[PDB]
Design a protein around this ligand. Sequence first.
Ligand SMILES: *P(=O)(O)OC[C@H]1O[C@@H](n2cnc3c(N)ncnc32)[C@H](O)[C@@H]1O
Length: 339
Amino acid sequence: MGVRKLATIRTAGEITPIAGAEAIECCHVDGWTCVIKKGEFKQGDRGVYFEIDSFIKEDNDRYPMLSKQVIDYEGQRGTRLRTARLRGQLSQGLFLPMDRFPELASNQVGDDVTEILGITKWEPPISTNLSGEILGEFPTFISKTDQERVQNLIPQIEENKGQKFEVTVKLAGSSMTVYRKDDHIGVCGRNWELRETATNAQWHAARRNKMIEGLQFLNRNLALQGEIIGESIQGNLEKLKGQDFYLFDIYDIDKAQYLTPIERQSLVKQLNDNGFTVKHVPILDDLELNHTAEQILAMADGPSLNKNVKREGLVFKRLDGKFSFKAISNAYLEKHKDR
Ligand SMILES: *P(=O)(O)OC[C@H]1O[C@@H](n2cnc3c(N)ncnc32)[C@H](O)[C@@H]1O
């Protein structure tokens, strides 16, 4: 991915009634489903769609329907959009008619108005031992690990029908990159490269599975990208003792592209055959893409790495390693509306 477009211009899709409810109805917006007030949209209308995790500052003219969910976040009063279920209808996000945004009248469908509207992403406080000291910015020559959501890739999901995809269990921790470029080998979080300390959990996991010595061994300019999970990391959903790294991507720094999935488990073999114990995120059966966004979301729920807990979702990586996305489990999101 790259740059989250929390507020976008979109078109109302199919609009369907909600049984038992007379003042509301269900509106499809790309792969999302959203409860709207009767009489705000007809199919094909333009509107501003705010995704879940949007933080929308308090405003009684533009957002008067958001006033009974007002909280404090970073010192600002405002509303965090989260997954909900109204009259049995799953509802995600906020969809508002163009007439409430005259200043956006000239924007086109697909335009990102996040910064025009002052929208920010709500996020939990990060863990104490995953903050360490910084050596410098996240490397400009390594890609970051954000994935776009399948709900937003409707044209791309059939463009890629017939294509094949590696299917991996999405693990709930924090992103972690261990990389080599020539003489230097570094450990990063999701946003910063980190200097080694006794307490830093990223370095401690990297030392414990000898992935620094493994990168020296392989003698290539590679970024090993994976998730650090376990105790004291985003609630430790997998019920693990301690912390550990689970790989999900390898980035070829020199060719500035990701290793394809088969190239990646070959290297994970090789690393382990040589005593460098780097685990991988659980791998499921490949998928030959012939599906709708809603059918893909149906795959998302299921067993996690711990086969006794229900997983955050799945990540799909095309076998050429050049088109990837996540499908997050709505069951998971509904279970966790309180985090
Ligand atoms: P999440 O909804 O937090 O969005 C993307 C991040 O998920 C993490 N992640 C865990 N497991 C995976 C796999 N298997 N593939 C890709 N990304 C994964 C990363 O830290 C992403 O930044």
